[PDB]
């Protein structure tokens, strides 16, 4: 055999360690689409693999060939724990890609309420619109995701209080 990208994707941490021991500065090596092992592990919710890769030297900021990021793939999957680990490394919480959105628009679209709560708590910008002009709250309202809307409303009211 499996590539370093599949080993990371599949949480095969002991094999991934061996691969990186034998190779020359492979941790940030992009595949055909620009994906790093960290983006693969992120996209699969493989928490201790992400931790290990960050510890080894992985760069969480890297964008793939259509601007896909570790944070937007973790947010898409609702993988709250990965979002935390990546935002401890001050990745761009509002990173925008040509698919048309951002981590918060992706967590909303998937009805991933715990990931929406975490991204808001981390300071994600509620005014950052989709390519279509919709804000995250516009999207929650349009989709009828009532709990997601509630947790957006709860956050908005805290932003204006000291």
């Amino acid at each position: 055999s499996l590539s370093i990208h599949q080993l990371a994707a599949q949480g095969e941490l002991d094999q991934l360690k061996e691969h990186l021991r034998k190779g020359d500065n492979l941790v940030n090596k992009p595949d055909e689409r620009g994906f790093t092992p960290l983006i693969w592990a992120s996209a699969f919710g493989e928490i201790e693999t992400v931790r290990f890769l960050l510890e080894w030297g992985a760069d969480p900021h890297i964008l793939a060939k259509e601007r896909e990021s570790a944070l937007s793939l973790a947010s898409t999957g609702g993988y709250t724990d990965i979002v935390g680990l990546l935002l401890e490394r001050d990745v761009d919480i509002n990173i925008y890609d040509w698919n048309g959105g951002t981590p918060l628009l992706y967590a909303v679209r998937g009805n991933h309420v715990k990931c929406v709560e975490a991204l808001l708590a981390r300071g994600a910008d509620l005014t950052t619109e989709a390519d279509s002009g919709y804000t995250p709250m516009d999207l929650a309202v349009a989709l009828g995701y009532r709990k997601v809307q509630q947790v957006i409303e709860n956050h908005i009211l805290k932003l204006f209080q000291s």
């Binding site: 994707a9 994906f35 896909e68 937007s72 898409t76 999957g77 048309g100 959105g101 679209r109 989709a130």
Partner: peptide, 13 residues
């Protein structure tokens, strides 16, 4: 085992 990268979501509804 061989796994496939998940897509970013479709913002249409």
């Amino acid at each position: 085992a061989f796994v496939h990268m998940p897509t970013l979501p479709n913002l249409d509804f």
